[PDB]
């Protein structure tokens, strides 16, 4: 009986794979980007990447290849999952809908076999005769491509070589032939076999096993024109083919290992090479033509081209463009030129995509000190290290604050017919109208000609022909720029009001009730045109001359009031077209027609806060999509605002919301604001690119943030951040950091570039004498980062070979100071495990960093929380509790010894603690007895932990080694000595991510209990919450209903995916819910959504409301 819920807050952003080809059309260039469980399909364009399709799969993508057999009009896609799900995919565009269809699938894991060296490798023959897998040592699995084999049946062949580094299929080979680098005793070797599938054996390869260098790792199979194989080692590159043998050993490449490649030119004249450094190389093969003799290979050379992000994945695209898949850093779109720039680089970045990278550690802070957490991650590694500040929502910056408990509308006002700046904001009021002349930045309420102050303005637009309108309770007044008085003024042929106002900068379309007139601000006078009567009372109206119309406006739309409807119409005629019947007893408060890039949009807000959304047609215009949200609980006013190239829709509610744009879609993110009642663009000479926004009581004006649901602000550290703490009193962060350095010829160590610790504002080194006794090395630092500016205020460098692994910001003992304590450790590469380390206690003062105390240890300090005014640490395998002498020193109180390796600890308010490396988790208490540890209980399973949390008094979350999550609790049980001494795994669940950090916090607010945020190696940020048994049960059920209804991509079974799994056991998931899947619900059609129900009560869209309520936890 454990009941948890897990959702993704941020999808993985690291890039594991990327592959290029024609997957969308025979004539289309696509870049397929593989995150972890996310496949991203693009079309390469002049601008770069046209997003087209983003699906998620039920597994971690380990293999991703495009291929095209015969008769096949375009490329199909092969994908192997890490749980050995193999599938084959096809891009299907049902004219206007899109689908990725599974042409074949099946699971290719084998009970036999130990997962090999260099991990899964999936290759595919040039002729497409088969697919070659290397899942295990000794085996080589072959999946024969045939029209059938829709279940991907496969055979294994025995592989004599038990240790294969890399393999490819050779080109221009009659028989399917593989080429591989393998390792034995006495070096590495390149060797070949034909693959005859009609016998299920191998056969001899075309060329004799040559040798390759000790560190050979990549095999490139050169295309048909050249044929053969390139082998890439350290400091050396070689070419093999039959008796042909070519070798270069360019000094330049010794510096760092080549990690990745890519064919640039189809013939393979040219390849890209990726470095551990981020260096980019061109590999060039000098061809050679000899009449009556196809071609040969005279030479090959390497040229340094420049520098990218550390590249996992490289892919030449169109002309000089290269996509850079990055895992340690931000991914990027990059450009190659024939000419280098200034210090010498042929590489020029074009676009950078944000990778929250490896989140190595993180922490929550409301920096703005409101009631929302921002989250602050140590990210990336080496040159890509960064902090990322992550903040939900879209904010605005407030410039004035005028108390006006009334404002019932407001429109812009340029008082000078030249400047695109306005100096007035005439504003509807509680049955009034106030004008507002501005002295630039100042505020002033005065009169204005032909604009009634006694009456309630319902509009105020920017009517052309040198005129200013003010439509009122009564009727459309008129004022000039030239005359500036009472130029004209309409009035209802009966002394009845205008109910609903309209106007763009050229039209006027009011309503009287059921009535629908039409007036014009023609040169200096308002002339009448049409009149039509409607079934019911006009609720709301919209007109704006969309695209192909200068001021004068095409078709129309309206919501009415007893038949709560929205309908499509024309202009002077009012001829009714298609329509829609929305439900309930609440009338449409607002209707809208818009545009962004390539669609004309229609939305309709109701008084319950909900909104229905649809698209119209400038040419025709009819019905579109039908979905239903929950923005405010209050009626929503829709409006459109000035921003970047794509100006957008702002929704006014108790939950202010922006509606931007996705692919060609539209964003739905919160605006970080109390409540916005009405809202409009502005620009005054004293307030430019400003937005105006009145609430219950107050005008406000300011710019906008980004757009997404999450805003991220990066602090480039240029080295690898490791741990991170917030010392509030000091208004700064502590960050442990590590920089790499190389052996000097003095013997010392230099540095490869300026980092955050070398460009530090001030600085200091360890003096401490506790110890006495090319080549690369780490230099470690505590950095002091201002919380507002994110400047490195101070840098404290630790000793030669001292890694700093843990950090806390705490007060200790009676002592009233907040210290920064750092646990460290002396690492020497030969050693298995450090035997020496220290704890160091520091204070950061006015702007100072004092070494307040040190403390020898006989190990590596892995973690340390602040217990109860004491410092609980943890060294190599011993867990301790330090007391702070009044004499200001850390002295031992007690220690627990029964650990293989204590890596993590957390503290449940009370005297309770938890953690371990290969042996899952322990629970400990502090006994104010003799002041001792009592080991309360442990989990008796072989979990190699990576992260540990306490969700509550009895519930412990755990993440491990194998991308699983688990929960333990203490066994409430008779025989309270053994059953008591044991805690049971009451929840299991395969996440699919490696978790580095849990911490309590949330990114949201100012059903569910708790909020635990987690930070993963892939850039994925998730959330774990707790549930009621009934909520659990509701959701479990609905989890299963949902799986019947939803087509999973490669036809992977959801529950196969979520299955707690190791290469020693596989159990199904218990006590866990992916809201990821629950949430999936809303993307479903109401038909397929009805099925989800057939059965305290049962409903058809009660659940639609349960699920909404959830999406808002993050």
């Amino acid at each position: 009986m454990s009941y948890n819920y897990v959702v993704t807050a941020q999808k993985p952003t690291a890039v594991n794979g990327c592959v290029t080809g024609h997957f969308t059309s025979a004539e289309d260039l696509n870049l397929l980007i593989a995150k972890n469980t996310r496949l991203e399909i693009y079309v390469v364009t002049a601008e770069g990447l046209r997003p087209v399709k983003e699906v998620g799969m039920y597994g971690k993508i380990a293999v991703m290849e495009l291929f095209r057999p015969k008769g096949e009009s375009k490329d199909l896609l092969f994908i192997l999952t890490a749980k050995y799900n193999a599938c084959i995919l096809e891009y299907k565009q049902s004219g206007e809908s899109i689908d990725i269809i599974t042409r074949a699938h099946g699971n290719v894991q084998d009970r036999i076999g130990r997962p090999s060296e260099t991990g899964i490798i999936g290759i595919i023959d040039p002729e497409c005769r088969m697919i070659g897998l290397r899942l295990y040592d000794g085996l080589f699995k072959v999946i024969p491509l045939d029209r059938d084999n829709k279940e991907l049946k496969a055979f294994n062949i025995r592989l004599e070589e038990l240790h294969v580094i890399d393999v490819k299929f050779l080109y221009g080979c009659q028989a399917p032939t593989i080429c591989f680098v393998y390792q034995d005793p006495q070096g590495r070797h390149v060797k070949t076999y034909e693959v005859s599938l009609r016998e299920k054996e191998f056969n001899k390869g075309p060329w004799k096993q040559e040798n390759v260098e000790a560190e050979a790792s990549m095999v490139i199979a050169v295309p048909e024109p050249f044929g053969g194989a390139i082998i890439i080692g350290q400091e050396s590159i070689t070419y093999h083919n039959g008796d042909k043998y070519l070798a270069i050993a360019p000094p330049i490449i010794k510096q760092s290992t080549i990690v990745c490649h890519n064919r640039v030119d189809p013939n393979g004249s040219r390849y890209l090479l990726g470095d551990m450094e981020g260096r980019l190389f061109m590999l060039l093969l000098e061809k050679e033509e000899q009449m009556d003799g196809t071609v040969t290979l005279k030479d090959l050379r390497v040229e340094l081209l420049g520098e990218t992000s550390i590249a996992e994945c490289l892919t030449y695209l169109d002309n000089g463009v290269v996509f850079v898949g990055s895992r340690l850093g931000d991914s990027q779109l990059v450009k190659l030129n024939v000419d280098s720039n200034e210090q010498g680089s042929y590489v020029v970045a074009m676009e950078t995509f944000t990778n929250l990278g490896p989140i190595v550690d993180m922490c929550v802070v409301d920096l703005e000190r409101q009631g929302q957490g921002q989250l602050v991650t140590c990210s990336g590694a080496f040159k890509e290290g960064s902090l990322r500040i992550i903040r939900n929502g879209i904010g605005i910056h407030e410039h004035a604050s005028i108390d006006l408990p009334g404002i019932k509308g407001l429109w812009p006002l340029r008082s000078d017919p030249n400047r695109e700046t306005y100096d007035t904001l005439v504003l509807s009021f509680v049955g009034q109208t106030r004008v507002l002349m501005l002295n630039g930045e100042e505020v002033e309420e005065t009169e204005l000609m032909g604009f009634v102050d006694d009456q309630q303005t319902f509009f105020c637009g920017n009517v052309a022909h040198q005129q200013l309108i003010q439509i009122t309770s009564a009727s459309v007044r008129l004022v000039s720029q030239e005359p500036k008085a009472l130029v004209s003024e309409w009035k209802e042929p009966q002394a009845k009001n205008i109910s609903v106002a309209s106007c763009n900068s050229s039209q006027v379309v009011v309503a009287v009730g059921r009535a629908l007139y039409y007036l014009q601000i023609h040169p200096q006078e308002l002339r009448q045109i049409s009149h039509t009567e409607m079934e019911h009372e006009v609720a709301c109206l919209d007109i704006t001359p969309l695209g192909d119309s200068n001021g004068l406006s095409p078709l129309c739309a309206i919501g009415l009031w007893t038949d709560i409807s929205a309908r499509i119409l024309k202009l002077p005629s009012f001829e009714l077209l298609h329509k829609e019947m929305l439900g309930g007893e609440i009338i449409p408060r607002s209707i809208l027609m818009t545009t962004f890039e390539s669609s004309h949009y229609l939305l309709c807000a109701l008084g319950d806060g909900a909104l229905f959304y649809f698209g119209l047609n400038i040419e025709t215009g009819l019905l579109s999509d039908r979905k239903k949200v929950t923005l405010g609980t209050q009626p929503t006013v829709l409006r459109t605002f000035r921003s970047l190239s794509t100006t957008n829709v702002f929704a006014c509610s108790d939950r202010p919301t922006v509606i931007y744009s996705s692919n060609h879609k539209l964003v739905f993110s919160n605006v970080n604001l109390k409540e916005v009642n009405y809202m409009c663009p502005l620009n005054s000479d004293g307030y430019p690119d400003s937005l105006a926004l009145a609430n219950n009581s107050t005008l406000t004006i300011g710019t906008i943030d980004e757009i997404q649901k999450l805003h991220i602000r990066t602090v480039p550290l240029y080295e690898s951040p490791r741990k991170i703490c917030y010392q509030e009193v000091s208004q700064c962060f502590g960050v442990l950091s590590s920089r790499i350095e190389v052996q000097d010829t003095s013997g010392g160590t230099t540095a490869l570039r300026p980092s955050a610790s070398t460009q530090a504002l001030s600085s200091s080194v360890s003096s401490s004498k506790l110890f006495s006794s090319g080549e690369e090395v780490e230099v470690h630092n505590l950095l002091i980062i201002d919380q507002h500016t994110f400047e490195v205020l101070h840098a404290h460098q630790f000793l030669q070979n001292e890694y700093a692994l843990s950090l806390v910001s705490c007060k200790l003992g009676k002592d009233p100071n907040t210290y920064f304590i750092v646990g460290t450790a002396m690492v020497y590469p030969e050693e298995a495990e450090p035997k020496q380390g220290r704890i160091v206690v520091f204070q950061y003062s006015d702007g100072k960093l004092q070494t307040v105390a040190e403390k020898e240890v006989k190990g590596a300090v892995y973690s340390m929380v602040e217990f109860n005014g004491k410092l609980l640490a943890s060294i190599n395998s011993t867990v301790r509790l330090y007391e702070w002498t009044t004499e200001k020193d850390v002295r031992t109180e007690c220690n627990h010894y029964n650990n293989i390796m204590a890596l993590y600890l957390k503290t449940k308010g009370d005297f309770i603690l938890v953690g371990d490396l290969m042996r899952s988790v322990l629970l400990l208490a502090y006994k104010p007895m003799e002041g001792n540890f009592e080991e309360i209980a442990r989990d008796f399973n072989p979990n190699w932990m990576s992260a540990v949390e306490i969700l509550d008094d009895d519930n412990f979350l755990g993440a491990e080694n194998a991308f699983n999550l688990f929960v333990c609790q203490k066994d409430s049980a008779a025989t309270t000595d053994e059953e008591r001494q044991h805690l049971q795994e009451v929840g299991l669940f395969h996440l699919g991510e490696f978790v580095n950090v849990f911490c309590h916090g949330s990114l949201v607010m100012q059903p569910t209990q708790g909020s635990v945020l987690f930070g993963t190696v892939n850039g994925m940020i998730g959330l774990v919450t707790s549930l009621s048994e009934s909520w659990y049960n509701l959701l479990l059920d609905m989890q299963n209903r949902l799986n019947k209804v939803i087509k999973s991509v490669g036809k992977i079974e959801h529950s196969f995916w979520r299955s707690f799994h190791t290469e020693r056991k596989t159990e199904p998931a218990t006590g866990f819910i992916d809201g990821d899947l629950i949430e999936s619900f809303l993307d479903i059609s109401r038909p397929k959504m009805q099925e989800v129900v057939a059965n305290r009560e049962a409903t058809a869209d009660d659940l639609i409301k349960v699920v909404e309520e959830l999406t808002r936890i993050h």
Partner: peptide, 13 residues
Amino acid sequence: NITRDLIRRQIKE
């Protein structure tokens, strides 16, 4: 050196 391995593990593969 297992400390180095763990540091490597946090940055994965």
